[PDB]
N, CA and C atoms as an extended XYZ file, in Angstrom:
510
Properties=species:S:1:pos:R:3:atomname:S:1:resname:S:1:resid:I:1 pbc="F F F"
N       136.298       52.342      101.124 N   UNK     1
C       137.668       52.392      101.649 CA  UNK     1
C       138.609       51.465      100.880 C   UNK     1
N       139.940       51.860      100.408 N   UNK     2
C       140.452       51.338       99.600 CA  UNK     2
C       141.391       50.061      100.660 C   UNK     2
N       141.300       48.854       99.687 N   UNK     3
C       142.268       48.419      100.467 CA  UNK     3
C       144.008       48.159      100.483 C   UNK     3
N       144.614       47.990      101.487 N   UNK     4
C       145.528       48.382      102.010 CA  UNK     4
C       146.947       46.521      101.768 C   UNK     4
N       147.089       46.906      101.247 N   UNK     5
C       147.975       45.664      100.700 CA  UNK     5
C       149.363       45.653      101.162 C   UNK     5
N       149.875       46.495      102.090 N   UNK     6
C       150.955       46.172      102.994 CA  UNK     6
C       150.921       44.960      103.895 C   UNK     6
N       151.796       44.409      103.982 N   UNK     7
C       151.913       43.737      105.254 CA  UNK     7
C       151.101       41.885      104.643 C   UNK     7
N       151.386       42.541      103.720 N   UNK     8
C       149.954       40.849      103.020 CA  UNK     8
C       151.052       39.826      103.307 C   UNK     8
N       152.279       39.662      103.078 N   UNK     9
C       152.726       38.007      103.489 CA  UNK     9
C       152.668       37.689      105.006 C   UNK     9
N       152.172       38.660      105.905 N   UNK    10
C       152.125       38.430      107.475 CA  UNK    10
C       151.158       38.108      107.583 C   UNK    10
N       149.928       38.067      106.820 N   UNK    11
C       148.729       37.313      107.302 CA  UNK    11
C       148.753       35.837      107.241 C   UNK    11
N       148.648       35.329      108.426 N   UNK    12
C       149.086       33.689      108.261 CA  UNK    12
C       148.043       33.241      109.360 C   UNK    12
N       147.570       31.738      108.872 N   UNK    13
C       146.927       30.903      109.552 CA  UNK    13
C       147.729       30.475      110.787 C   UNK    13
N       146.878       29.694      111.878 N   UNK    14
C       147.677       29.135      113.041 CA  UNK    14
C       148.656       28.107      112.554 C   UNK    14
N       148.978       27.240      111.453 N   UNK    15
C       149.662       26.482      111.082 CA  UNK    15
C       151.077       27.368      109.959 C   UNK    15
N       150.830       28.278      109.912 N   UNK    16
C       151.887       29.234      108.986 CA  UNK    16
C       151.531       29.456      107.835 C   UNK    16
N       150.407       29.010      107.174 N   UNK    17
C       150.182       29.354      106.113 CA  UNK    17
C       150.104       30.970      105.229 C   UNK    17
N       150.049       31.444      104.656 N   UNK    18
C       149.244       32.686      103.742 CA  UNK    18
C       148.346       32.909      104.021 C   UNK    18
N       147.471       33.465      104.567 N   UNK    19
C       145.880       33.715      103.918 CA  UNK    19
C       145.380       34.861      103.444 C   UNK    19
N       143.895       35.300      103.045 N   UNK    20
C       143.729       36.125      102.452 CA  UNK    20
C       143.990       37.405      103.175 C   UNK    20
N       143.939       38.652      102.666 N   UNK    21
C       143.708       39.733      103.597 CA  UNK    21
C       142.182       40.004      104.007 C   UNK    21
N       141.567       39.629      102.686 N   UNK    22
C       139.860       40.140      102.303 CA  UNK    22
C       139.359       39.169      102.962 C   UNK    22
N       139.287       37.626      103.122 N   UNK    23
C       138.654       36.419      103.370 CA  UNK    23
C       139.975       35.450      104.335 C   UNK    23
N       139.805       35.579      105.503 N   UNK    24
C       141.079       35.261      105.876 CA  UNK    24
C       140.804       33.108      105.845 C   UNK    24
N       139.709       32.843      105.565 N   UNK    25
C       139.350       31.286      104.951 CA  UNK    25
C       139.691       30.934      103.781 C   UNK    25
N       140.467       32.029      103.498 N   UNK    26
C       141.295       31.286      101.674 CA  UNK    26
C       142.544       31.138      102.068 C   UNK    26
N       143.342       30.289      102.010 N   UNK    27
C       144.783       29.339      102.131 CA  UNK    27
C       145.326       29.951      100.794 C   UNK    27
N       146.215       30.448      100.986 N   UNK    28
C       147.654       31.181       99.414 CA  UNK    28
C       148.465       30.276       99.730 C   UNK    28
N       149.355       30.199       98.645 N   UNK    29
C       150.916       29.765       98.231 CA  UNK    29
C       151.163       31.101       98.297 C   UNK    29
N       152.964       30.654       98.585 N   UNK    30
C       153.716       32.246       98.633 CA  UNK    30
C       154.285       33.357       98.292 C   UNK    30
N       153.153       32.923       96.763 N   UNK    31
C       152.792       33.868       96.031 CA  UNK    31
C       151.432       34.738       95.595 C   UNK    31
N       150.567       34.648       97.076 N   UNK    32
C       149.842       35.230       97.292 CA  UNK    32
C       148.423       34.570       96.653 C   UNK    32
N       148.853       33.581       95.575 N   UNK    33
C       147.589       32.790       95.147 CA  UNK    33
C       146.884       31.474       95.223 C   UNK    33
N       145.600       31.419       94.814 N   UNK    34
C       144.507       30.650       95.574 CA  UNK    34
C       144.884       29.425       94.729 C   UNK    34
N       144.744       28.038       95.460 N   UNK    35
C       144.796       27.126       94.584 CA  UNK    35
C       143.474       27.117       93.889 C   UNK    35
N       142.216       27.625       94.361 N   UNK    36
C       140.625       27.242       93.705 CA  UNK    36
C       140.169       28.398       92.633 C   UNK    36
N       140.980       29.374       92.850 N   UNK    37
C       140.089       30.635       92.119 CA  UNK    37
C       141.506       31.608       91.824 C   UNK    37
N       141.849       31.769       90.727 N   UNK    38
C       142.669       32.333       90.368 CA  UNK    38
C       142.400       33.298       89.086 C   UNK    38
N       143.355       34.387       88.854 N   UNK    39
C       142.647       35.568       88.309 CA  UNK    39
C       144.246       35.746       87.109 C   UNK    39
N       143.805       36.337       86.141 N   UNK    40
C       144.601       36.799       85.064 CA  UNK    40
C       144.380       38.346       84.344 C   UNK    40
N       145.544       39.017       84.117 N   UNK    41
C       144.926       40.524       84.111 CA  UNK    41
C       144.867       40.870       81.985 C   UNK    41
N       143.748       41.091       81.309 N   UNK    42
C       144.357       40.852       80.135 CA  UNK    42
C       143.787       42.729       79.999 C   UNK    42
N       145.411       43.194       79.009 N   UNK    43
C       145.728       44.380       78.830 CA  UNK    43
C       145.261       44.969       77.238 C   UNK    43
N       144.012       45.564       77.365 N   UNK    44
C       143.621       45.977       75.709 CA  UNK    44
C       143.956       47.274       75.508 C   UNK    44
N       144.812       47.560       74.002 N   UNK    45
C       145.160       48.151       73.561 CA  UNK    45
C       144.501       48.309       71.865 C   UNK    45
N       143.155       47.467       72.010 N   UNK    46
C       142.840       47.434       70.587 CA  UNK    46
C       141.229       47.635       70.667 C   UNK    46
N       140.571       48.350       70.579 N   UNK    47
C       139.024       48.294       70.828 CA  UNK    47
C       138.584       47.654       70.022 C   UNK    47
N       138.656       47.478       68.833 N   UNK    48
C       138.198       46.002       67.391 CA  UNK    48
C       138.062       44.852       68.249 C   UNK    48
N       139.221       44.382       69.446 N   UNK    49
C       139.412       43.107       70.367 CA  UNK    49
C       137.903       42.810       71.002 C   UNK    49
N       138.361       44.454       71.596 N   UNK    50
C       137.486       43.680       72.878 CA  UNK    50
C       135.822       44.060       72.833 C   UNK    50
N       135.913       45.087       71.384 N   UNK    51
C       133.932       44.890       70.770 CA  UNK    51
C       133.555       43.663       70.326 C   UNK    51
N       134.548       42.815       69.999 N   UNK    52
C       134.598       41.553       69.117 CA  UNK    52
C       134.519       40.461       70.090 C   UNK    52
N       135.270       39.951       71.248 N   UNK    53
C       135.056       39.774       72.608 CA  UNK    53
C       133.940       40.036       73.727 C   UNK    53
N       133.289       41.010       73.398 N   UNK    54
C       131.892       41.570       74.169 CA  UNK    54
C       130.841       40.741       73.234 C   UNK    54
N       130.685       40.650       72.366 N   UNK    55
C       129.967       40.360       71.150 CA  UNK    55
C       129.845       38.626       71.096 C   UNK    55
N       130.923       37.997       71.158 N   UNK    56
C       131.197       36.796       70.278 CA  UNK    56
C       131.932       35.598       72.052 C   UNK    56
N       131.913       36.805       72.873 N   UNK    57
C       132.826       35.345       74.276 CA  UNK    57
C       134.000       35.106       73.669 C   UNK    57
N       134.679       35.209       73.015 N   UNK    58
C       136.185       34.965       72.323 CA  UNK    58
C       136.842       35.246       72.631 C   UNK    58
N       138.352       34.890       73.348 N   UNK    59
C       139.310       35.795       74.019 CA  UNK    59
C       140.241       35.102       73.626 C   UNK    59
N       141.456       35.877       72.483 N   UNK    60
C       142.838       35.819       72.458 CA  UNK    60
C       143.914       35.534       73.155 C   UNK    60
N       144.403       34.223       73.647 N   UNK    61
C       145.943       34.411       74.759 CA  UNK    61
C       147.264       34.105       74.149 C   UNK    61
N       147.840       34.910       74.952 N   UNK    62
C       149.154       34.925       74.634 CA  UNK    62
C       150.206       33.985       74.428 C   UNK    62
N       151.094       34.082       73.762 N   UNK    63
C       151.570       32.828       73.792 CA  UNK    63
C       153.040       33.097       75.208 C   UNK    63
N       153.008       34.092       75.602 N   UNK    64
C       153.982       34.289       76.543 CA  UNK    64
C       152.891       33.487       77.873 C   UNK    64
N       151.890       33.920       77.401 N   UNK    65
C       151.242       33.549       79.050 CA  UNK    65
C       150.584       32.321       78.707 C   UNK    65
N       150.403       31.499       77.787 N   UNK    66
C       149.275       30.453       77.693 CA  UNK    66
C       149.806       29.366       77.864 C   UNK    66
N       151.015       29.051       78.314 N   UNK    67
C       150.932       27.971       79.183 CA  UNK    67
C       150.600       28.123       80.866 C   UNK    67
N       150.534       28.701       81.364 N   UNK    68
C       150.376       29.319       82.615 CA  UNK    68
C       148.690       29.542       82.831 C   UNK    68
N       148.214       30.021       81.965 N   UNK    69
C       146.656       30.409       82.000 CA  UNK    69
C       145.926       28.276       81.507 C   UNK    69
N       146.736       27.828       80.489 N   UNK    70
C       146.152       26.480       80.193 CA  UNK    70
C       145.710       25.508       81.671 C   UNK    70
N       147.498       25.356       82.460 N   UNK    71
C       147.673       24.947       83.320 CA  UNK    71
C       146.977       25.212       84.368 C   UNK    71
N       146.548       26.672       84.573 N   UNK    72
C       145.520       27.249       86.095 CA  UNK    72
C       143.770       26.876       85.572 C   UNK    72
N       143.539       26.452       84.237 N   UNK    73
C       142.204       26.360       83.344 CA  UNK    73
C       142.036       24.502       83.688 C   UNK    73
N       143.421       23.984       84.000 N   UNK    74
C       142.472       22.426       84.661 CA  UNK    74
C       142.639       22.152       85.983 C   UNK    74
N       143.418       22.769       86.501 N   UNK    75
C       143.007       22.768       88.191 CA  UNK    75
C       142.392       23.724       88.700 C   UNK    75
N       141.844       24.815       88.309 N   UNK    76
C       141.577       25.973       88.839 CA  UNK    76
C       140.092       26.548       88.454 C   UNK    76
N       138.950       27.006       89.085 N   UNK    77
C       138.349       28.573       88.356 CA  UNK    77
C       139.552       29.577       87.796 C   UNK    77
N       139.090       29.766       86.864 N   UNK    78
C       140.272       31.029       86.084 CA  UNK    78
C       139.325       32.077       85.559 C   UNK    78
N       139.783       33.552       86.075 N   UNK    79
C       138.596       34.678       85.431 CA  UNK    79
C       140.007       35.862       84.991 C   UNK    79
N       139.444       36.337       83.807 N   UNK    80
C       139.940       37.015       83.038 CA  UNK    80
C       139.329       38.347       83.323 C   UNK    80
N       140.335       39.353       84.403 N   UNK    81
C       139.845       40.923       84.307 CA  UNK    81
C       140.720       41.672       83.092 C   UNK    81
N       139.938       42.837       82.624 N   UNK    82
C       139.854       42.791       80.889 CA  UNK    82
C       140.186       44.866       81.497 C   UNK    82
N       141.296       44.989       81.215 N   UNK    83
C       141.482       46.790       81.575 CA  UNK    83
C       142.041       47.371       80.310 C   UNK    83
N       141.613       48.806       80.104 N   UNK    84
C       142.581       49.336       78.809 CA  UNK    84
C       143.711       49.480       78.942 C   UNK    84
N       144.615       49.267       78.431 N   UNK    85
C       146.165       50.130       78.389 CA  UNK    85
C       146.120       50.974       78.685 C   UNK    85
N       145.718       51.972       78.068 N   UNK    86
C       145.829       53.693       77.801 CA  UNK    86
C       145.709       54.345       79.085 C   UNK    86
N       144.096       53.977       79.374 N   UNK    87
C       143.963       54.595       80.486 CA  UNK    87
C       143.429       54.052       81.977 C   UNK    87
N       143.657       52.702       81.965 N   UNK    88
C       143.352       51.678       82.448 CA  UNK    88
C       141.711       51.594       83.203 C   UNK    88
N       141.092       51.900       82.447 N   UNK    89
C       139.791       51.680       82.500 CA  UNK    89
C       139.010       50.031       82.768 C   UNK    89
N       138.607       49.998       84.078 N   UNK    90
C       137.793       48.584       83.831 CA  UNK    90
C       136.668       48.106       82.054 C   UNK    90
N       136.998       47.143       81.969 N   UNK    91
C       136.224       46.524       80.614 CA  UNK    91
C       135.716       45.771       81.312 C   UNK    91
N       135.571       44.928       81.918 N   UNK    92
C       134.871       43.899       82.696 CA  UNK    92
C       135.482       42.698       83.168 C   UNK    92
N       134.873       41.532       83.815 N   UNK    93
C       136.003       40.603       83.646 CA  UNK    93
C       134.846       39.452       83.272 C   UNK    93
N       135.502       38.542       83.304 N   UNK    94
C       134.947       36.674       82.460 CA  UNK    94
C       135.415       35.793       83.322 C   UNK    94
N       134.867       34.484       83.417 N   UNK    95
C       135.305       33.418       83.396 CA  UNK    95
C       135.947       32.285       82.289 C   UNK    95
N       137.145       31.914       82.500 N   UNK    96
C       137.175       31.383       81.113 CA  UNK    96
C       136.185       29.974       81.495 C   UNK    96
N       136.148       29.370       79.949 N   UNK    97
C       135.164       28.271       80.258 CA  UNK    97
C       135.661       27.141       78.921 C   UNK    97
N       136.450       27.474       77.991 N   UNK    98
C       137.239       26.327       77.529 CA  UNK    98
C       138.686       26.711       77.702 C   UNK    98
N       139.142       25.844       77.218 N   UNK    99
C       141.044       25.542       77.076 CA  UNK    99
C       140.889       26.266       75.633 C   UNK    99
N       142.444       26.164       75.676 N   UNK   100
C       143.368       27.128       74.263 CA  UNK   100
C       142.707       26.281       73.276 C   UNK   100
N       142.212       26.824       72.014 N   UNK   101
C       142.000       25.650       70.770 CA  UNK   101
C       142.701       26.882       69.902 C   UNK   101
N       143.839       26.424       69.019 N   UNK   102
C       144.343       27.030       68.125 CA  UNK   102
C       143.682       27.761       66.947 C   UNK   102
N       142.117       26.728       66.784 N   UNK   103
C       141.483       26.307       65.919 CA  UNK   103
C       140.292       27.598       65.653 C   UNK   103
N       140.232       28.251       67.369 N   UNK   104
C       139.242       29.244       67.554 CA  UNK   104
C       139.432       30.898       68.051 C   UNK   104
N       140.823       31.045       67.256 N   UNK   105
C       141.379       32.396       67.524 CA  UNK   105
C       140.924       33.285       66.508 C   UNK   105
N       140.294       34.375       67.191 N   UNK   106
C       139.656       35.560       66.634 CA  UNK   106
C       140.379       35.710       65.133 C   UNK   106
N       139.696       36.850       64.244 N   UNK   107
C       140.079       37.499       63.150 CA  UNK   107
C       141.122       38.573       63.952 C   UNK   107
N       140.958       38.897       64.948 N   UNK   108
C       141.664       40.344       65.226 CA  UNK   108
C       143.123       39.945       65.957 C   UNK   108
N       143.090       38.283       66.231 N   UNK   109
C       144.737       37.964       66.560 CA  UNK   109
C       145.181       37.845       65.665 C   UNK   109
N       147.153       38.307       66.139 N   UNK   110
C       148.221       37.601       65.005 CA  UNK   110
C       148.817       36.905       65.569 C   UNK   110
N       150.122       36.604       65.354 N   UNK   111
C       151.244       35.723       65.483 CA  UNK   111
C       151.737       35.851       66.989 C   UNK   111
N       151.175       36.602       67.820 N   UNK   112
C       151.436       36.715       69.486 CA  UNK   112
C       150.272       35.328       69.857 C   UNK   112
N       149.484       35.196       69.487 N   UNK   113
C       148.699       34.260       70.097 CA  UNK   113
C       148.866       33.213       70.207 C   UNK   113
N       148.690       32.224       71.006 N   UNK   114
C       148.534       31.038       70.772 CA  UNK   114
C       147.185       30.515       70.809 C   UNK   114
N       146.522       30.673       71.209 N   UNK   115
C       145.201       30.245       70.487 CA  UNK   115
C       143.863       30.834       71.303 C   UNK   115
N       142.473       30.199       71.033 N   UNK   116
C       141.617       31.160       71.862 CA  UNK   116
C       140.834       30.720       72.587 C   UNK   116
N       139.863       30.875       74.074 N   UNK   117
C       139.430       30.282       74.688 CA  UNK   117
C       138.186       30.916       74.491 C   UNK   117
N       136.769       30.375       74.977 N   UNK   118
C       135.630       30.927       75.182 CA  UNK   118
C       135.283       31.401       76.755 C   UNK   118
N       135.050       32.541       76.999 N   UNK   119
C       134.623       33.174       78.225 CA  UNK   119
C       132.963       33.153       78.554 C   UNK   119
N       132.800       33.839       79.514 N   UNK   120
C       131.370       33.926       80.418 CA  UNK   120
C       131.531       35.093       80.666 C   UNK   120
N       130.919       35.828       80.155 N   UNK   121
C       131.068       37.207       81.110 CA  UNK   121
C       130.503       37.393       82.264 C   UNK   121
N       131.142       38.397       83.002 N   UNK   122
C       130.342       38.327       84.558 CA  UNK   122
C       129.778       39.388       84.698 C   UNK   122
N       130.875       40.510       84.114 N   UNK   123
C       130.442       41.846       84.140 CA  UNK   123
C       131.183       42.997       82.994 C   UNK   123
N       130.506       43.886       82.253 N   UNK   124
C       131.292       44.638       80.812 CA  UNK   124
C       130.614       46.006       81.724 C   UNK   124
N       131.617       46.519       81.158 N   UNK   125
C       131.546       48.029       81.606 CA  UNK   125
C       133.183       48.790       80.698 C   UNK   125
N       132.695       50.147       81.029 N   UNK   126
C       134.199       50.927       80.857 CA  UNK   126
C       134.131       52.024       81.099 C   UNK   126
N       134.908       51.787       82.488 N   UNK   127
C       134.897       52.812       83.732 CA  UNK   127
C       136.209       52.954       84.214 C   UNK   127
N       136.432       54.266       84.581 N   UNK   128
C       137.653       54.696       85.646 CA  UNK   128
C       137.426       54.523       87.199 C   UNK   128
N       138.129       53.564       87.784 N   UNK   129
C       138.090       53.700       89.160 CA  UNK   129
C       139.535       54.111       89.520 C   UNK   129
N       140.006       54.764       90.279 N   UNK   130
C       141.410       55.330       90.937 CA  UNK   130
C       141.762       53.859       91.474 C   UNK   130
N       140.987       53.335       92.452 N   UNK   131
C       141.951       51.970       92.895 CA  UNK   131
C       142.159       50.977       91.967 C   UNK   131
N       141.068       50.553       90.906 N   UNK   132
C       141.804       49.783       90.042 CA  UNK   132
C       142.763       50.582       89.511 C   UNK   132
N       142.439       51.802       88.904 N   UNK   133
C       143.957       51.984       88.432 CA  UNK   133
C       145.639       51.707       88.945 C   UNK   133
N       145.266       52.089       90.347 N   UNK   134
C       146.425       51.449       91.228 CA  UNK   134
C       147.010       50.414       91.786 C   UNK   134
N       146.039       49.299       91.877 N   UNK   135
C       146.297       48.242       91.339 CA  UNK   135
C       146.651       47.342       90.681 C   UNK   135
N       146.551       47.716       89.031 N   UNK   136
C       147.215       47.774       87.994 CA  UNK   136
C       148.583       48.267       87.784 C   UNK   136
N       148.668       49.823       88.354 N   UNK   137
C       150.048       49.922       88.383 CA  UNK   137
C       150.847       49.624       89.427 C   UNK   137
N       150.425       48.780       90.118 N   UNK   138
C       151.702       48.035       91.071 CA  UNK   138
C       151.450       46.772       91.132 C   UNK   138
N       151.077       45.918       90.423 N   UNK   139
C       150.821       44.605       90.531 CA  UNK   139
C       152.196       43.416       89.762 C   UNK   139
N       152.803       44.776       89.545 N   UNK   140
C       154.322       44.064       89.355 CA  UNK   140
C       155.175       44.776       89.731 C   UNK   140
N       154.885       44.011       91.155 N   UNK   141
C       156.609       44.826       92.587 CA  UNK   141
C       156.249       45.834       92.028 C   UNK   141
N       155.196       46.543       91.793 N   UNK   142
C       155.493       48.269       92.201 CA  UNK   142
C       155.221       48.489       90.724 C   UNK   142
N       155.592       47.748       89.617 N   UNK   143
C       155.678       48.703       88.474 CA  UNK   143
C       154.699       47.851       87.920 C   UNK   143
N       153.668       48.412       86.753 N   UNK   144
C       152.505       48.220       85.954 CA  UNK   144
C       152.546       47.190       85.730 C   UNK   144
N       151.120       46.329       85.287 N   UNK   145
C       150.769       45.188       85.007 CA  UNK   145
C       151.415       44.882       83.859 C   UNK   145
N       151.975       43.498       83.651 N   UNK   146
C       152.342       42.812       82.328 CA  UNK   146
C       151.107       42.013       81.866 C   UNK   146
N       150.615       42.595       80.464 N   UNK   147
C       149.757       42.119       79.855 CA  UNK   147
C       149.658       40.532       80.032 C   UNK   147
N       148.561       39.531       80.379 N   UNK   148
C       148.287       38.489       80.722 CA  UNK   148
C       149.016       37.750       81.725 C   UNK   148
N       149.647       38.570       82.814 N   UNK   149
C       150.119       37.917       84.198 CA  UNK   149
C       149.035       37.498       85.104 C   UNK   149
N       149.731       36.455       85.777 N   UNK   150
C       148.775       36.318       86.926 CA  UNK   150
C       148.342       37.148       88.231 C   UNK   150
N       148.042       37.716       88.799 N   UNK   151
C       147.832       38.204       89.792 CA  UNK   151
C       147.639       37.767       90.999 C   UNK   151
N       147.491       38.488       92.118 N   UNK   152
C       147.615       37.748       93.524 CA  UNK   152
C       146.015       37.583       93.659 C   UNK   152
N       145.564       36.548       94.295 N   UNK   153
C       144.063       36.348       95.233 CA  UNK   153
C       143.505       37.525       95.400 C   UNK   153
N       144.271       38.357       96.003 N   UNK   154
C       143.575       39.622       97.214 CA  UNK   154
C       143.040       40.820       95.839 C   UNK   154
N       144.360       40.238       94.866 N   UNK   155
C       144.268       41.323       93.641 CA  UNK   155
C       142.649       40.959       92.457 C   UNK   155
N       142.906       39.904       92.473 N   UNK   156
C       141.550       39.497       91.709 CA  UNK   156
C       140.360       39.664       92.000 C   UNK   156
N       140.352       38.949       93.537 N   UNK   157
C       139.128       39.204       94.054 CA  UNK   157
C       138.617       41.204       94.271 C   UNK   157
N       139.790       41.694       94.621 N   UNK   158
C       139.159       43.559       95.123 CA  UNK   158
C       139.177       43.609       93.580 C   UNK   158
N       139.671       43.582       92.970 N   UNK   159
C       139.350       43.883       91.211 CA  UNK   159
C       137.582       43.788       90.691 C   UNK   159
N       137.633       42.570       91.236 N   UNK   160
C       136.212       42.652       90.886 CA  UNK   160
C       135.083       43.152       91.221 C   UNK   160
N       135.274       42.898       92.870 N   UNK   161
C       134.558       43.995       93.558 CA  UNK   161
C       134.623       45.318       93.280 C   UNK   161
N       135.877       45.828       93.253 N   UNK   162
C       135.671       47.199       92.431 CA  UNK   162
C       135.130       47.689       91.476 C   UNK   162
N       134.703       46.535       90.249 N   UNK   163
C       134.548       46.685       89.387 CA  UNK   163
C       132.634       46.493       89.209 C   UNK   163
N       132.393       45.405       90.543 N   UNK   164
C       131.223       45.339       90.542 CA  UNK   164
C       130.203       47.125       91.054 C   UNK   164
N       131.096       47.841       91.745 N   UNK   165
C       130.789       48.754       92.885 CA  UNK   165
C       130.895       50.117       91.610 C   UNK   165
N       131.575       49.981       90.791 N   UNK   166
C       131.906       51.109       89.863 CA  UNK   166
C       130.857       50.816       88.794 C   UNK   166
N       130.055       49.896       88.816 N   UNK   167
C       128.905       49.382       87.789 CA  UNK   167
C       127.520       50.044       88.257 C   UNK   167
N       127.436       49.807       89.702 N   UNK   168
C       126.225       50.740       90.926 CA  UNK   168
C       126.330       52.137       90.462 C   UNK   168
N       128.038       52.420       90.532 N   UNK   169
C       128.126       53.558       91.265 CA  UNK   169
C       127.158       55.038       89.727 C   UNK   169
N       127.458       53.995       88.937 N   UNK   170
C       126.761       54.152       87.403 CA  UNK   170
C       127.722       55.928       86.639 C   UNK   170
């Protein structure tokens, strides 16, 4: 059953807080995200990337988003879900597990990057699920994901689960 993401800023603790929809023991800011576990959506449009990335733990960030991903990488768990452009197919997602080093950006970045972190993978696949796809395309007010945005709690966490469930579903 897919879930249902209306009504998400009305879920609130007895003190007024946010909480989750999925885990109502996770506390949000009012922007829907976790201070402990936070999620980033990265958008491939290059298969060289992300065979090279499956292969090697190497992941390219942006320089639009890498102060934002640096900053959530020392207070935070930070996991990187990894979808195609085209047809927004799950790739899998990661944990990141270092900070930006300028020093360790792939052969396959250019001049968009600012530098590269090392991941963990959790899970690689490349699969069509309908709810991730929809997810993706409304995870900005309604209109498609911006390559390396942050996403909401509720969004990261069903991402993965979906992604774990579309791995079974074989």
């Amino acid at each position: 059953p897919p879930l249902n993401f209306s009504r998400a800023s009305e879920h609130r603790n007895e003190k007024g807080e946010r909480i989750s929809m999925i885990n109502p023991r996770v506390v949000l800011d009012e922007n829907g995200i976790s201070h402990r576990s936070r999620y980033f959506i990265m958008l491939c449009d290059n298969e060289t990337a992300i065979a090279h990335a499956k292969k090697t733990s190497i992941w390219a960030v942006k320089k639009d988003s890498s102060k934002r991903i640096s900053d959530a990488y020392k207070k935070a768990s930070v996991y990187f879900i990894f979808v195609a452009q085209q047809t927004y197919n799950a790739l899998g997602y990661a944990q990141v597990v270092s900070d930006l080093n300028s020093t360790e950006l792939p052969f396959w970045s250019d001049s968009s990057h600012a530098g590269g972190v090392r991941i963990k993978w959790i899970k690689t696949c490349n699969l069509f699920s309908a709810e991730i796809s929809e997810i993706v395309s409304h995870m900005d007010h309604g209109s498609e994901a911006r390559d390396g945005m942050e996403m909401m709690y509720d969004e990261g966490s069903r991402l993965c689960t979906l992604i774990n469930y579309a791995i079974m579903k074989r």
